[PDB]
Design a protein around this ligand. Structure first.
Ligand SMILES: CNCc1ccccc1-c1cccs1
Ligand SMILES: [Yb+3]
Ligand SMILES: [Zn+2]
Length: 606
């Protein structure tokens, strides 16, 4: 059972389909309309059922053309309020009915960010985008807000006619709204059963450019050209992913580049991946994020975690495929380089949380924990470390990739637990059970802290990064002169980033050393968001005041939680920038993404 959901479980009733008919009201910041849920009873004599909601206003519930009784329970914090519907006629097992709910969202919907014209690129039009993962779909429409349930959907979305609506679905046409000529209705169809966290909507002044046989890139006009270039590897990555994962079942693979406050690097909404514009480095260097979102088309979207306790299933497998795609494009040494970088990120997380902290277990117990609060690198990197370790244990990448493909096949269109995965791992590798029985399962899966075993990593591309980082760490004042721009000559941007990641692990460095780095390496001039992020962190943590306005600017001009949260925390912990950091948050708070605002607020204790 799903402790993040207040809805009737899948063992009671299942949503098969949603027809969503809504209007986007920019003047009121509400979505208004009907969610028609096709529900199948799993039980004899079913007379009521419960849906998740959050900050919704229910007008009425209609079954068989008549209003029926419903009640909203008290709010349960971030879970929202359960909505019990009285069925007018007891259902037998497998009977299906359509339940039509008239609802309206609140402006404060935790699933939505509403932007003014000024917060966009064009400055002329407002913009709406959704983000449902993990449990924010309830803040858009009444539903069984649990990934243990999969449904197809259709939608009709009325928006101001000058704007464009897109969803996580195939575009099924547009017409003028008959009820309001200032408006357009966009239509959408999603034929593949999906968990409701994959429902996605954007409305804004969007244009598109084709970048591959099955990929358009969407954004405001100011970002189209740059986006078409940055993500031009998309088709190549899709083919590799299809080779590894099996058929891509989703029809199109489009990309939407969001405004800068989108809270994640990307979101694998089916048919329409959402990405942060912080990927726009000019050189495709951040394309692993595309590979990652592509990989979710199998791991996460076909095979889905049954509850959020098993999020690692979604994320570790996706990181694993992600790194294989990048390894195929750029080589097995690169794959190892990234794998090892990932382990460093896990070291960071476990250090931050504390080695005994519950959120450092692979499988977590989210009972009374907001998934947004528990979210971190752990399920990604500990999940990946487990798979990379098993890969090495079980006979190498070719062999474990055979398992991954069989695993996807086996659990397509299904929702699964860690036990489901482990059972199938044993089934698939039954000739290797003795080897599998050497794994310390309880530790890997259920214990806090770093994994009990570290995989083996090729060091070829890492060595130079460590060597340089060690030079800076061990340098005394009389050694600073010897540093020079040519130190970086043979380092790729990835290596620059790992160099900085290495150094950041030992921060603070002395202020003089950091001043010299800028003098010789000019890191202030690098716009690569990953590098600039780590660089600014190293500056603020080494107490360099000049870096304060640079850190405040990055923290607020984009809102990728990966970058925004630790910049604010760093600024808050630096006594010289502490008050300004708090002040800056308070000023931007109302205009921030509601999830990002809530978490930064917690981080800052304001
Ligand atoms: C005022 N009528 C438009 C409307 C109101 C409430 C909910 C939905 C709608 C839609 C019309 C067309 C697509 S949604
Ligand atoms: Yb010396
Ligand atoms: Zn992911």
């Amino acid at each position: 059972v799903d402790t993040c959901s207040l809805a009737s479980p899948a063992s009671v009733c299942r949503t098969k389909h949603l027809h969503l008919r809504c209007s986007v009201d920019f003047t009121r910041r509400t979505l208004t309309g009907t969610a028609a849920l096709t529900v199948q009873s799993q039980e004899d004599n079913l007379r009521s059922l419960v849906l998740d909601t959050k900050d919704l206003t229910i007008e009425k519930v209609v079954i068989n053309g008549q209003e029926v009784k419903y009640a909203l329970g008290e709010r349960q914090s971030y879970k929202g309020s359960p909505m019990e519907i009285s069925l007018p006629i007891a259902l037998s097992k497998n009977q299906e009915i359509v339940i039509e709910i008239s609802f309206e969202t609140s402006p404060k919907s935790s699933a939505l960010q509403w932007l003014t014209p000024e917060q966009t690129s064009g400055k002329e039009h407002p913009y709406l985008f959704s983000q449902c993962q993990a449990i924010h779909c309830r803040a858009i429409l009444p539903c069984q807000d649990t990934p243990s349930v999969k449904l197809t959907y259709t939608a009709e979305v009325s928006v101001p006619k000058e704007l464009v609506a897109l969803m996580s679905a195939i575009r099924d046409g547009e017409t003028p709204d008959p009820e309001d000529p200032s408006r357009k209705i966009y239509k959408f169809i999603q034929k593949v059963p999906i968990p409701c966290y994959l429902i996605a909507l954007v409305v804004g002044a969007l244009e598109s450019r084709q970048i591959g046989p099955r990929t358009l890139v969407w954004s405001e006009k100011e970002q189209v050209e740059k986006s078409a270039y940055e993500f031009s590897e998309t088709e190549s990555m899709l083919k590799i992913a299809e080779d590894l994962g099996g058929p891509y079942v989703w029809g199109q693979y489009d990309l939407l580049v969001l405004p800068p406050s989108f809270p994640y690097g990307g979101m694998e909404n089916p048919c329409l991946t959402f990405v942060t514009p912080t990927l726009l480095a000019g050189d495709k260097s951040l394309s692993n994020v595309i590979a990652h979102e592509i990989s979710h088309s199998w791991t996460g979207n076909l095979v889905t975690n049954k509850t959020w306790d098993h999020f690692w299933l979604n994320e570790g497998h996706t990181v694993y495929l992600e790194r294989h795609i990048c390894g195929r494009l750029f080589g097995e040494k690169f794959r190892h380089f990234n794998a090892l970088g990932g382990w460093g990120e896990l070291q960071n997380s476990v250090k931050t949380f504390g080695e005994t902290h519950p959120f450092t277990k692979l499988v977590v117990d989210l009972t009374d924990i907001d998934p947004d609060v528990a979210y971190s690198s752990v399920p990604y990197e500990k999940g990946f470390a487990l798979l990379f370790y098993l890969e090495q244990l079980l006979g190498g990448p070719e062999i474990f990739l055979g398992f991954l493909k069989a695993y996807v096949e086996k659990f397509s269109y299904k929702s699964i637990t860690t036990d489901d995965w482990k059972d199938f791992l044993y089934s698939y590798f039954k000739d290797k059970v003795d080897v599998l029985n050497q794994v310390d399962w309880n530790a890997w899966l259920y214990s806090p802290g770093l994994p009990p075993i570290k995989p083996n990593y090729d060091m070829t591309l890492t060595n130079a990064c460590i060597a340089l980082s060690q030079r800076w760490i061990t340098a005394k004042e009389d050694d600073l002169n010897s540093f020079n721009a040519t130190d970086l000559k043979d380092l790729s941007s990835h290596q620059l980033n790992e160099f900085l990641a290495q150094t950041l692990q030992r921060a603070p460095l002395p202020l003089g050393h950091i001043k010299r780095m800028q003098e010789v390496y000019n890191f202030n001039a690098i716009n690569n968001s990953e590098i600039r992020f780590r660089w600014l962190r190293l500056c603020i943590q080494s107490k360099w005041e000049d870096a304060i306005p640079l850190a405040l600017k990055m923290a607020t001009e984009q809102g990728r939680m990966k970058f925004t949260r630790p910049l604010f925390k760093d600024l808050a912990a630096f006594d010289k920038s502490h008050d300004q950091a708090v002040r800056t948050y308070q000023e931007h708070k109302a205009s921030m993404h509601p999830v990002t605002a809530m978490l930064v607020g917690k981080d800052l204790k304001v």
